[PDB]
Structure formats: structure tokens, C-alpha cells
Amino acid sequence: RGNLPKESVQILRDWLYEHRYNAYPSEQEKALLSQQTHLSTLQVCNWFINARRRLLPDMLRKDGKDP
């Protein structure tokens, strides 16, 4: 199988941090992310569905707010 390219995942991670208080990209943002990361839309969607569960709280805890 394999994992997603590290630069692709770097971009998604940076976006999630910057928008961590509304971690839901619009259709156009998802489209920009797809093109930037060279991933499909479905891949970008799936990453966000996983990352809102697996990365985001640890981010918002480090911040004071409680998910």
C-alpha cells in the first residue's frame, strides 16, 4: 500500500493548524489542497475526516480550548 507523500501531508497539516477553529475547508479550499498536494479530492476529504479525530484535539488542547 504505502503512505501519503510527506510534503502532501505537510500541506494538509499546516492548513489544519491555521484553520484549527473551523477545521472544515470549503469546496474551493479542498480543491486547492487537492491540487497543491497532488492528492484526489477523496483523499483530501478522508485525511480531514481522520485528522479532525486524530490530530485536532491534541492541537486545541495545547491551546486551552477543549474540543
Judged by the rule CB under 7 A, the positions of this chain that interact with DNA are 1-4, 9, 24, 30, 42-43, 45-50, 52-54
Q: In whole angstroms, how close is the CB of 16 to DNA at the nearest point? A: 12
**Toward DNA, which CB reaches closer, 53 or 65?**
53
* Distance (Å, whole) CA 60 – CA 39: 26
Least distance from DNA to the Cβ atom of residue 35, Å = 16
The minimum distance between CB 64 and DNA, in angstroms, equals: 20
Q: What sign has the CA pseudo-torsion 37, 38, 41, 43?
A: negative
Question: Which region holds residue 24: left if phi is over 0, alpha if psi is between -120 and 50, else beta?
Answer: beta
